[PDB]
Coordinates of C-alpha atoms and ligand atoms in Angstrom, one line a residue:
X9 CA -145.4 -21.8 -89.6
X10 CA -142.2 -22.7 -91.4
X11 CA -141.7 -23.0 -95.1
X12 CA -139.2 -25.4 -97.0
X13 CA -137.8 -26.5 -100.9
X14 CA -137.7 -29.9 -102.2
X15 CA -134.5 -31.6 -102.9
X16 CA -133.3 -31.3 -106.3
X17 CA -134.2 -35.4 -107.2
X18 CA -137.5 -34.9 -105.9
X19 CA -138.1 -31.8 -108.0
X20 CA -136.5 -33.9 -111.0
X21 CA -138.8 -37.1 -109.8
X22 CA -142.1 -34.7 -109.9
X23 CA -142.0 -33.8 -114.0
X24 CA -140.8 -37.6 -114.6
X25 CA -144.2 -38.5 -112.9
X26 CA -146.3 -36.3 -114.6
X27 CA -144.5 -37.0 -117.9
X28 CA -144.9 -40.8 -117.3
X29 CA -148.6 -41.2 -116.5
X30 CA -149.6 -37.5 -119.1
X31 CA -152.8 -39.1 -120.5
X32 CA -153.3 -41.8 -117.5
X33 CA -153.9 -39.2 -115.0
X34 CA -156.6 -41.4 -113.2
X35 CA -153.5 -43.4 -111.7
X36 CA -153.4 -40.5 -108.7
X37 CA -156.2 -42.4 -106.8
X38 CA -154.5 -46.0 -107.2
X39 CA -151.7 -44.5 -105.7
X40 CA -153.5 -42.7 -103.0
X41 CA -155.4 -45.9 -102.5
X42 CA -151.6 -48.1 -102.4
X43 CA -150.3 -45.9 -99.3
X44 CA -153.4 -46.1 -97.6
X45 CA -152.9 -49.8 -97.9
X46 CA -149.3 -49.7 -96.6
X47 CA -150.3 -47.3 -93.9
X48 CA -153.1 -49.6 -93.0
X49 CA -151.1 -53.0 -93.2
X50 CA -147.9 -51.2 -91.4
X51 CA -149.7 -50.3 -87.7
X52 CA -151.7 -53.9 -88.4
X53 CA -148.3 -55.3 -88.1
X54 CA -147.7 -53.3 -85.2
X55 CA -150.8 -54.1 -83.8
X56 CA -149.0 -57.9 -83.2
X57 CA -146.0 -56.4 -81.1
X58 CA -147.9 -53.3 -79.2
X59 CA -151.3 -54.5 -77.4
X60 CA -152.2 -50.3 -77.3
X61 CA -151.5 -49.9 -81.0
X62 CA -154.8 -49.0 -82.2
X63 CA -156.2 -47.1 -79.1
X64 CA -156.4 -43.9 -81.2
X65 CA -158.6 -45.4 -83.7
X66 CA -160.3 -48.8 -83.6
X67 CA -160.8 -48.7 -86.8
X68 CA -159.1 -50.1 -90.2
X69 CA -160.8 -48.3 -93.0
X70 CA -160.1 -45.8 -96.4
X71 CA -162.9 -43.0 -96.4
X72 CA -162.9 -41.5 -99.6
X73 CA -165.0 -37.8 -99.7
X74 CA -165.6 -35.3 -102.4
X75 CA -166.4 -31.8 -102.4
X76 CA -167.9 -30.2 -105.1
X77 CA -168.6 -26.3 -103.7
X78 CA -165.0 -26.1 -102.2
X79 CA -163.5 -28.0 -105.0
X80 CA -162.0 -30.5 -102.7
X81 CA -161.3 -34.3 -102.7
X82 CA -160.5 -36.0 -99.7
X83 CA -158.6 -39.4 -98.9
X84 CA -158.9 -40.8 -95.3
X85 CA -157.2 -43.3 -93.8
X86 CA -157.1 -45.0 -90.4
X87 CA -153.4 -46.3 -90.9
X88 CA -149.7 -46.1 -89.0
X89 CA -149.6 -41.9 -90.0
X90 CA -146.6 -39.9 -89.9
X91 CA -145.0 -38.1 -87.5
X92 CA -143.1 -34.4 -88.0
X93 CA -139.8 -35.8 -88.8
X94 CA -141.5 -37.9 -91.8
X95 CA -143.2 -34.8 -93.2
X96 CA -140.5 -32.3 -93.3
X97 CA -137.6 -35.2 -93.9
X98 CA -140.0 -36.1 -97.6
X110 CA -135.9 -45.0 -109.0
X111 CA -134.7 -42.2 -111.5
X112 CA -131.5 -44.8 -112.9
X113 CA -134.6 -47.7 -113.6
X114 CA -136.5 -44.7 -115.1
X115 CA -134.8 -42.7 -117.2
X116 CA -133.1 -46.1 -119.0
X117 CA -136.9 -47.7 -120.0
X118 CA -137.8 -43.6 -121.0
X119 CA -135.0 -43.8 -123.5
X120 CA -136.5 -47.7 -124.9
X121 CA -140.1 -46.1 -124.7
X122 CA -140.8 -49.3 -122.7
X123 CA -144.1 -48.7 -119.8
X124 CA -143.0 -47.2 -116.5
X125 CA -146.3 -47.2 -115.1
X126 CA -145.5 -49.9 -112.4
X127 CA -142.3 -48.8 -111.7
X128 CA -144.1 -45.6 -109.6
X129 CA -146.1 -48.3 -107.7
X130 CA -142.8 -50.8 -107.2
X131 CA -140.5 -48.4 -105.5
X132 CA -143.7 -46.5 -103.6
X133 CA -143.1 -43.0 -104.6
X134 CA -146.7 -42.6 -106.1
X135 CA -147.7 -39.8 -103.8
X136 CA -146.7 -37.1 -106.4
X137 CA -149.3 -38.3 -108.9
X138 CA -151.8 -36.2 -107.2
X139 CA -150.3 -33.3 -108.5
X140 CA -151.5 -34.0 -111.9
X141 CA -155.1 -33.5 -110.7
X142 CA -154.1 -31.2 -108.1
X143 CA -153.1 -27.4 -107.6
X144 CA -152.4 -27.9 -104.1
X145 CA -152.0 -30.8 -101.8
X146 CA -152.7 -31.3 -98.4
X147 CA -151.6 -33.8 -95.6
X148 CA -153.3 -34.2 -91.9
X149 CA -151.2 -37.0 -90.3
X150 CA -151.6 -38.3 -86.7
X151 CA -148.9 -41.3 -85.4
X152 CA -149.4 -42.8 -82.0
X153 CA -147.2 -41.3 -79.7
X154 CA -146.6 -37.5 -81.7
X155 CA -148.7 -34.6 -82.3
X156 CA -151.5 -34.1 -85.3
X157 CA -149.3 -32.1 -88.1
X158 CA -150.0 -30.1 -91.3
X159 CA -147.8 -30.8 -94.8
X160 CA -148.9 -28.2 -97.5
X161 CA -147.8 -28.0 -101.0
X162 CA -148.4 -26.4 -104.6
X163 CA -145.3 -28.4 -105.8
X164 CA -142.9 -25.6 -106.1
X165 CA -142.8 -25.4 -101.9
X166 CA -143.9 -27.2 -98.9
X167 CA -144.5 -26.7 -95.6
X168 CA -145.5 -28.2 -92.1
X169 CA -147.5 -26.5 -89.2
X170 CA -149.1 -28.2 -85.8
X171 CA -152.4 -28.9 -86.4
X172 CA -154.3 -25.6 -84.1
X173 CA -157.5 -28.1 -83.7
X174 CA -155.2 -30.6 -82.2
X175 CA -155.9 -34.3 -82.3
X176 CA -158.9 -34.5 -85.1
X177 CA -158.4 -38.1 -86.7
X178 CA -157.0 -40.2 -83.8
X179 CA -154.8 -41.7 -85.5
X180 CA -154.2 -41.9 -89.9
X181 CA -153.8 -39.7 -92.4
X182 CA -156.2 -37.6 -94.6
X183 CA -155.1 -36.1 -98.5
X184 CA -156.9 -33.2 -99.2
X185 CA -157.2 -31.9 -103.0
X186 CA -157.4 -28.5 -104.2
X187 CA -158.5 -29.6 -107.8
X188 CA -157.4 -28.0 -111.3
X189 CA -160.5 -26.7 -113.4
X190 CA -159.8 -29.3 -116.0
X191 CA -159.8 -32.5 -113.0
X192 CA -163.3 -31.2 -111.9
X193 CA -164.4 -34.3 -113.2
X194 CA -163.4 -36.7 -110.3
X195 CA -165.4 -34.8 -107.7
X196 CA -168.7 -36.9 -109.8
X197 CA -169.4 -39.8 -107.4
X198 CA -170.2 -42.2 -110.1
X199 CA -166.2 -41.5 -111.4
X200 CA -165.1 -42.0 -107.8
X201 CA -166.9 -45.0 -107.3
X202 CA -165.8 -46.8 -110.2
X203 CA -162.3 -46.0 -109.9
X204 CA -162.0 -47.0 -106.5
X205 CA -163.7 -50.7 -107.4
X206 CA -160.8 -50.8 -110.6
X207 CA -157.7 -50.3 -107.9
X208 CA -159.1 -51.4 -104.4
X209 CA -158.7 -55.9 -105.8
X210 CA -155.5 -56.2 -103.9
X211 CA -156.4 -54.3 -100.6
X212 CA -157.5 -56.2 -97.6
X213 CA -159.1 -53.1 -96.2
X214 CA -162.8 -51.4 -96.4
X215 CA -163.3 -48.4 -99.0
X216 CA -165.8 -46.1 -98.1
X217 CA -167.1 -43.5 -100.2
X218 CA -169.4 -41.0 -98.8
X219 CA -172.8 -41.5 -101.2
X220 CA -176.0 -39.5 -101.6
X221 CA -179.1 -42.2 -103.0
X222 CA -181.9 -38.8 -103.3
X263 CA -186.8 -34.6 -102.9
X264 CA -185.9 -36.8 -100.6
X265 CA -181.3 -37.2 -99.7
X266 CA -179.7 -39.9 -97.7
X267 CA -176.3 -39.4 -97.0
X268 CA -173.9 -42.2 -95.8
X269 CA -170.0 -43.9 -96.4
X270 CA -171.3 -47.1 -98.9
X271 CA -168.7 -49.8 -98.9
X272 CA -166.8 -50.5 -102.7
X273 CA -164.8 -53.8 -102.0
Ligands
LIG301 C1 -142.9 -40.4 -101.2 C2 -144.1 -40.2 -100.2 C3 -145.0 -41.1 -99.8 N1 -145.9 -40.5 -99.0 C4 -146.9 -41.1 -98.3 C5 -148.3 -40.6 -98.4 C6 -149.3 -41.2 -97.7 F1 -150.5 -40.7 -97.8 C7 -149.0 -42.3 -96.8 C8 -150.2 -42.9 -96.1 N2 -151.4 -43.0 -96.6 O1 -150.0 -43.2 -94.9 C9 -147.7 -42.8 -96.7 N3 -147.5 -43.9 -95.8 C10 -146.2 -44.6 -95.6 C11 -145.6 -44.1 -94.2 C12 -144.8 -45.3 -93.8 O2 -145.7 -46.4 -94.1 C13 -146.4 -46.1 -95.3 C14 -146.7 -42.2 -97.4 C15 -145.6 -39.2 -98.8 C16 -144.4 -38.9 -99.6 C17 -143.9 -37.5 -99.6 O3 -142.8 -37.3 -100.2 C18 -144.6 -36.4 -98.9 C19 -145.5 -36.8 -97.7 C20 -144.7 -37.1 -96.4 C21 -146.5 -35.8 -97.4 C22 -146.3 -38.1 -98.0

């Protein structure tokens, strides 16, 4: 356990986001969808220097889950991670000068990467299991007014990735609908060299199983 506040800019970049992308709220899962891609491409890269790179986890894959009895949506990724440091240690000139024009800042969120905090327009609370190759499986925790970061008490879970859990508002209720999910995913996953997986039911007969989108 230890709890900490955001720095003023991020607090200030937060309710710029949310402003921005209002009546676009989908936009949270291309963005969740863009750093799982960065994650993924960044220990791929690494892969080329470090020979043991990818012992944690073989595989290269985004498995997205929904949960519709605990209101939960979860984004799993096989990527680089994050260590301790990166969680507790985490634009607005470019912004606020095209807010002023009325001009679209939509891909301004996506250029400079800070895209993270568009789950919060969905979300109540936001959670974040990361595991990086040679640190420990950590905890980040937030409701956007504080965060935190905890060890992980089950230890070493994913192997190596990260995995965005989302507590859901009552009026986002609507992206836990596999059918939503699925075309989303197929409307931001064009650019990404990766496999998206979304975990399907066909159905009184039920077949569950991760069906592939790209
Ligand atoms: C900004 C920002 C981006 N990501 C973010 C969020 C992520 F989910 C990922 C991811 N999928 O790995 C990711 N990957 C980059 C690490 C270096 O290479 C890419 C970054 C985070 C933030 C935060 O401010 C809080 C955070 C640390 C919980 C997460």
């Amino acid at each position: 356990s230890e709890k900490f506040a955001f720095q003023a800019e991020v607090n200030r970049m937060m309710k710029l986001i949310i402003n921005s992308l209002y009546k676009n709220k989908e936009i949270f899962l291309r963005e969740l969808i863009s750093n799982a891609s960065d994650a993924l491409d960044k220990i791929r890269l690494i892969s080329l220097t470090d020979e043991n790179a990818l012992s944690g986890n073989e595989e290269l894959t985004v498995k997205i889950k929904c949960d519709k009895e605990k209101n939960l949506l979860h984004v799993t990724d096989t990527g680089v991670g994050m260590t301790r440091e990166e969680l507790v240690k985490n634009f607005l000139n470019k912004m606020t000068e095209a807010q002023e024009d009325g001009q679209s800042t939509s891909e301004l969120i996506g250029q400079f990467g800070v895209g993270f905090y568009s789950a919060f327009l969905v979300a109540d609370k936001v959670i974040v299991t990361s595991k990086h190759n040679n640190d420990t499986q950590h905890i980040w925790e937030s409701d956007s007014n504080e965060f935190s970061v905890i060890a992980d008490p089950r230890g070493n879970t994913l192997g190596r990735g990260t995995t965005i859990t989302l507590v859901l508002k009552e009026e986002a209720s609507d992206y836990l609908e596999l059918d939503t999910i699925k075309n989303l995913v197929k409307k931001y996953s064009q650019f990404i060299n990766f496999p998206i997986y979304v975990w399907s039911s066909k159905t009184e007969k039920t077949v569950w199983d991760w069906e592939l989108m790209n």
